[PDB]
Design a protein around this motif. Sequence first.
Motif: not given
Length: 144
Positions: A18, A73, A123, A134
């Motif tokens: 991420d 994502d 996400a 995240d």
Amino acid sequence: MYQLEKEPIVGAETFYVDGAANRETKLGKAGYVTNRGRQKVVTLTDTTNQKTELQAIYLALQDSGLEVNIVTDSQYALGIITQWIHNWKKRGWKTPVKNVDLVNQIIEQLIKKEKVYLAWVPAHKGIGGNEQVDKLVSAGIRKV
Ligand SMILES: CC(=O)NCCc1ccc(O)c(-c2c(O)c(O)c3c(c2O)C(=O)c2c(cc(O)c(C(=O)O)c2C(=O)O)C3=O)c1
Ligand SMILES: [Mn+2]
Ligand SMILES: [Mn+2]
Ligand SMILES: [Zn+2]
Ligand SMILES: [Zn+2]
């Protein structure tokens, strides 16, 4: 040049990558968390949100073995990498100037591997792998 797997490699380590960046300060963070007790996060300056997602994939490539599962994502990052693989040595192919350098370093690491599985997930909220990386990249960058 290469062709990725349509299904994740059984037994291989999975990298939940991420990236996050702030538009006002251009500060960003990119990293990953793995299902084998490994994590990493780096601080970046003069970066964009798309650049942090590609950098997170680059870190997962350089820190993994010959077989790696990567869950991002980022539809852009998965798209711009898959299109590069499908359209090499083809006629109507033209490299995008957008992050041309960063994507080129990812392809060089992609060839060094033997089995790579790239998948996109939206996400989401939870306690899974995408949710842990995240909070790591968004800390001090954006409000979640
Ligand atoms: C999810 C939620 O409500 N709360 C959790 C904390 C929170 C709050 C707001 C966020 O925006 C996010 C947030 C992420 O943390 C994040 O990593 C991402 C996104 C996020 O939105 C995207 O949106 C997003 C991301 C990658 C992409 O490639 C796209 C694309 O390719 O199109 C999109 C897209 O927007 O289209 C992405 O990586 C996280
Ligand atoms: Mn992301
Ligand atoms: Mn996220
Ligand atoms: Zn092998
Ligand atoms: Zn999850």
